[PDB]
Structure 1
Amino acid sequence: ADEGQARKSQLQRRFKEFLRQYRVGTDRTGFTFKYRDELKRHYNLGEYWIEVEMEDLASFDEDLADYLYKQPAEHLQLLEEAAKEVADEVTRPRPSGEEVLQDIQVMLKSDASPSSIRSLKSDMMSHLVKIPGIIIAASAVRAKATRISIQCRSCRNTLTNIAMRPGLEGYALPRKCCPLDPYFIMPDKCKCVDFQTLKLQELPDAVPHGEMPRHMQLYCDRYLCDKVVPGNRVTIMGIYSIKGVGIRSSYIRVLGIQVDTGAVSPQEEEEFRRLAALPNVYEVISKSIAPSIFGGTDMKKAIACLLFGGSRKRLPDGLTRRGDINLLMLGDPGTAKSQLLKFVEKCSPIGVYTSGKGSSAAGLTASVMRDPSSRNFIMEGGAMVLADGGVVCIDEFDKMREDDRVAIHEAMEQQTISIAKAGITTTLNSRCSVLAAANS
């Protein structure tokens, strides 16, 4: 309808003005245009993305922010189109070989408070939501169509530039120009993009006593691919929507990702250079390690050396030397052994904590099992694979069985795991430190 087209056009103009007029600063110093400059610098580097902030847009015009909160699917595409046409006038004219205009992805960010998965009343269908949690499963990458062309089997008529919806929903072809299923897709004319799927787990402290944790399904697209891995704690922003006779599944379409925990800024390098320069840094670091635990200064010093580690080497005749360090603590009960392990797992950039009594050989190194889909055998990584490059804390170390402690002799020295089972033979990496505690 023409009224709908007029409304779309008007809203697109308002988004465009927000991008090309917004400024920060004071007249006592000077003003800068926040989003124009970012579009220019990102386009000239071959990026094609920007990260708009809801707080800013809400301040420039409350109505636009309101619409983009209640009707995100309908309005976000107007914003993406606006960003594209601004990028053009901000960069044009481009050199030879650059004359064709590319498409921009717009990501969203905000300062407001999260809500738990359990808070999602079904009144929230298609509304914009912000959720925290842990990633527990992650797919490999696939190709997804954005626009296609098709041709007729019997009489070779065609239809072209057929638009495909984003998210986890499909499409159906026409039957006119013939047989009942007359058209087929042309793969050479498919404009495809990367896409991936994930599963999210509700936070351990948010779930009450006497209930299950809820879990949720996520869709991931273009520049967001391979940004995270399982076990990480993250904050997600996205659209919430649907995918006995009346049951239907549901999932979230992600629009922005923040890892609750990136490249170091220049300022941060200056501070680290200062820390490296000042003369008694060894004692400073030693006092930072496990500050609540009384005494044990030598033990804290040894732990510091474990976290920094030696250096890896490759020799001229092709052999390797391991570089990293293994440490064992043995003796009396009630002496804070378990507390130190519990700290080092949080202090290290990569770390895992497991109990010797509650673990198996196939669980420590790696395992082989049949795929729940298809019928094929597939590989799985144990604790010493997930902690590759980091520290592994083995608690209750003296309570493993003999045949299970035997399983880690390759991993602790040669830093690799050799497997030969079920008709598959491969070698995996495990470049990690072992920290262990035991009794007499």
Structure 2
Amino acid sequence: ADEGQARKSQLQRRFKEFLRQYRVGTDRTGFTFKYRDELKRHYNLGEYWIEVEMEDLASFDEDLADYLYKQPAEHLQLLEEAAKEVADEVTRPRPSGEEVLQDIQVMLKSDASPSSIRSLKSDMMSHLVKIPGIIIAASAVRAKATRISIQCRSCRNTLTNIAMRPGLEGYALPRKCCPLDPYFIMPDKCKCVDFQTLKLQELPDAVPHGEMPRHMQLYCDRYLCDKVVPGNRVTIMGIYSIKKFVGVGIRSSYIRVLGIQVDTGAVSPQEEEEFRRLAALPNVYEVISKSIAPSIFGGTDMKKAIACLLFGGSRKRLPDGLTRRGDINLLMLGDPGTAKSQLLKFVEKCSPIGVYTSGKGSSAAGLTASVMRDPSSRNFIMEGGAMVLADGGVVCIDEFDKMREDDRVAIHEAMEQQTISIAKAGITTTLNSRCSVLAAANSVFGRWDETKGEDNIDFMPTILSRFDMIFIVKDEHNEERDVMLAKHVITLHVSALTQTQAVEGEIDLAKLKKFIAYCRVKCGPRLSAEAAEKLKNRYIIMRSGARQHERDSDRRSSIPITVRQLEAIVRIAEALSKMKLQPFATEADVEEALRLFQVSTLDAA
């Protein structure tokens, strides 16, 4: 109908004028056409998408924002077409090979407070919704047709450029041209886009008491594909809608995603300047150590070890192809009630990639990888365990001594070789497990009992050798420490109401996380030559001391000292250098590494 086409044209023109006319700034400073320039730069870069803020659209034209909130399926098509023509007039003339105009994906975002999965009742259907969650599964990218052409099978007539509805809903082929089903879809003359289905688990904070966590199906389209991976925490803006292919009148529901916001790697130049300043200032090591678990009194050397673990050493591929791990493995044996579990809970939060597991709650398959039959296909498929989910990050195994021996055995390849070799059910692969293992455990006799000596440790030498640093954090009674600790604890409990203010000489958790990510991707150090000479000599003295202690006891020590410990000192020094973004580890960096390992070696005397 001409009236309907007039309505669509008017709304498209209004969106066009929004994208043409919207500005930010003031006359005192200046103005930039935000979405014009974003369209131009993205098109010239070949990105073909933009990110329209709902608040900006509301400020320009509140009726458009309200229409897009209530009926996004109708109006997002008009907005995308408006963006396409605005991109055309903003970019043309274009060079050779860029004459044809490309479709523009208008993602959108909002400053509004989000809803939740259990808040999504039936009345929210076909509206814009904004919910948080965790991605637990992610499909492989698959092609969905946006336009098709269908050719009659008998007489070879063709219907071309039929518009496919977006989302998971399909299209009904005509039953008239011939046979009852005259048509087939031409596989060449059709245009397709990437799409990817995800499963978004409810936030653990959002689960009501006693409930299992719900999850919601997501549909990601075009440039939203591979924008998020499993384990990430996101806010999803999308259209709650039915799938459209026990009981009768039931239809499955999903969210058509049109905006992804990672709630927590592309840093801004301002953030890069901040990170370079942090690396440059002289006491960054102490600043990081104070920033790690600021609510935890004491344990400063253990916090320094955790800093070295978070930044990690440098992976190296040698001329014969053998690879050396840069990740640092840190065990915390000791007495109960000593903030080991809290330090693990801080590291899970603080690491750029971090996975927290209970040793007793884990299994060999669940840690490394599981082989399971795909229900919809009958094939056996792979499932990532914690060590695969934490690849490029940290695994926090709490209550590590409660694992059965056969399950602790499973992580031996992944701790050292940083791979998970699998040969099960006819599928044979070698997954990557480039991750750091941070473990916490209690003594065999509950508290560490100095009279019993090496009997306080039940871990095998083979798994103990794989830990770069082993702390026996004993809880030593002392009235002064106890008074100061109790005062700290009580003031901490009182400080649960004071607006979460920051502290001098400290990095915020988010800034520390981003700084760790930046340093990890950017800097890979090495040892200086004289520093390596120093480490060589000190390693010989240390090994001689360990051998003589074992001879004097006439019993092999539980904790070994091996070439892995040498390389552990190497990568600890490299981590200390990587904190400062220095290409080389100095004699002082090696000295601090030796000091930390000496704390971890007094703990093996």
Deviations 1:222-244 (A, max 9, x none): 010011122222111111222x3
In the alignment, the residues of structure 2 paired with residue 43 and residue 205 of structure 1 have an alpha-carbon distance, to the nearest angstrom, of 40
Distance 1:208 1:333, change over 3 A: closer
In the alignment, the residues of structure 2 paired with residue 193 and residue 239 of structure 1 have an alpha-carbon distance, to the nearest angstrom, of 19
TM-score (norm 2): 0.70
Secondary structure of 2:345 counterpart: helix
1:206 equivalent in structure 2: 206
Secondary structure of 2:395 counterpart: strand
In the alignment, the residues of structure 2 paired with residue 402 and residue 9 of structure 1 have an alpha-carbon distance, to the nearest angstrom, of 70
Shift of 1:143: 0.7
Distance 1:230 1:305, change over 3 A: same
Shift of 1:212: 4.7
Shift of 1:210: 4.9
Shift of 1:121: 2.9
Q: Percent of aligned pairs with the same residue?
A: 100
Distance 1:409 1:51, change over 3 A: same
Distance 1:305 1:149, change over 3 A: same
Q: Point out the structure with the larger helix share.
A: 2
CA contact (8 A) 2:356 2:398 kept: yes
- Greater alpha carbon shift after TM alignment, 127-136 vs 249-258: 127-136
CA contact (8 A) 2:142 2:196 kept: yes
Shift of 1:323: 2.1
CA contact (8 A) 2:198 2:219 kept: yes
Distance 1:69 1:360, change over 3 A: closer
Deviations 1:273-314 (A, max 9, x none): 111111121111111111111112222112111111121111
CA contact (8 A) 2:201 2:216 kept: yes
RMSD: 1.6
Shift of 1:211: 4.5
In the alignment, the residues of structure 1 paired with residue 143 and residue 93 of structure 2 have an alpha-carbon distance, to the nearest angstrom, of 33
Distance 1:358 1:76, change over 3 A: closer
CA contact (8 A) 2:387 2:395 kept: yes
Shift of 1:374: 2.2
Secondary structure of 1:357 counterpart: coil
Q: Point out the structure with the larger strand share.
A: 1
Distance 1:412 1:2, change over 3 A: same
Shift of 1:144: 0.8
Distance 1:327 1:245, change over 3 A: closer
Secondary structure of 1:117 counterpart: coil
Gaps of 5+ in 2: 444-605
In the alignment, the residues of structure 2 paired with residue 388 and residue 213 of structure 1 have an alpha-carbon distance, to the nearest angstrom, of 24
1:140 equivalent in structure 2: 140
Shift of 1:106: 0.6
Distance 1:389 1:177, change over 3 A: closer
Distance 1:170 1:273, change over 3 A: same
Shift of 1:435: 1.6
Deviations 1:98-143 (A, max 9, x none): 2111111111111111112222232222121111122222211111
Gaps of 5+ in 1: none
CA contact (8 A) 2:230 2:389 kept: no
Deviations 1:321-351 (A, max 9, x none): 2222112222222222222222111121111
CA contact (8 A) 2:231 2:389 kept: no
Secondary structure of 1:287 counterpart: helix
Distance 1:333 1:9, change over 3 A: closer
TM-score (norm 1): 0.96
Secondary structure of 1:335 counterpart: coil
In the alignment, the residues of structure 1 paired with residue 67 and residue 278 of structure 2 have an alpha-carbon distance, to the nearest angstrom, of 48
Secondary structure of 1:198 counterpart: strand
Secondary structure of 1:35 counterpart: helix
In the alignment, the residues of structure 2 paired with residue 412 and residue 118 of structure 1 have an alpha-carbon distance, to the nearest angstrom, of 39
Distance 1:397 1:206, change over 3 A: closer
Shift of 1:271: 1.2
In the alignment, the residues of structure 1 paired with residue 191 and residue 410 of structure 2 have an alpha-carbon distance, to the nearest angstrom, of 49
